[PDB]
């Protein structure tokens, strides 16, 4: 995946360039809060205001897993 590139044009759109939370809660430390399995699910199936399947395909995987490393 280019996980970061995706995030840098998908998640940051609400989570902020910095992932520190802007229009949405900070996922900077999502990988610590929740496992790739959970984060991936959230990306795929959104959550509250977050529309599910913002990323799809290996995109979402790479993002989630890259985030699993980002703590
Ligand atoms: C704005 C339309 C969003 C985009 C684009 C992405 N996310 Fe998001 N996310 C958003 C909100 C409003 C919320 C909270 C939803 C609620 O009201 O309950 C979230 C939540 C997450 C979470 C879980 C955090 C938590 O609720 O405890 C994760 C792990 C997450 N989001 C990841 C994520 C990624 C990686 C995205 C890019 C593919 C992404 N989000 C986009 C709003 C928005």
From Swiss-Prot:
Where it sits in the cell: the answer is: Cell membrane
- Annotated residues that bind heme c are located at 11, 14-15
Q: Does the keyword Lipoprotein apply?
A: yes
Question: Has UniProt tagged this entry with the keyword Heme?
Answer: yes
Which Gene Ontology CC terms are recorded? plasma membrane
Report the membrane topology from the UniProt record. Answer: Peripheral membrane protein
Keywords of the record, alphabetical order, are: Cell membrane, Electron transport, Heme, Iron, Lipoprotein, Membrane, Metal-binding, Transport
Question: Principal place where this protein is found?
Answer: membrane
Locate the coiled-coil region(s) and give their ranges.
none
The free-text function statement in the UniProt record for this protein reads: Natural electron acceptor for a formate dehydrogenase.
Q: What is this protein called?
A: Cytochrome c-553
- Organism of origin is Sporosarcina pasteurii (Bacillus pasteurii)
Which lineage ranks, top first, belong to the organism behind this chain? Answer: Bacteria, Bacillati, Bacillota, Bacilli, Bacillales
**Entire-sequence positions represented here:** 22 to 92 of 92
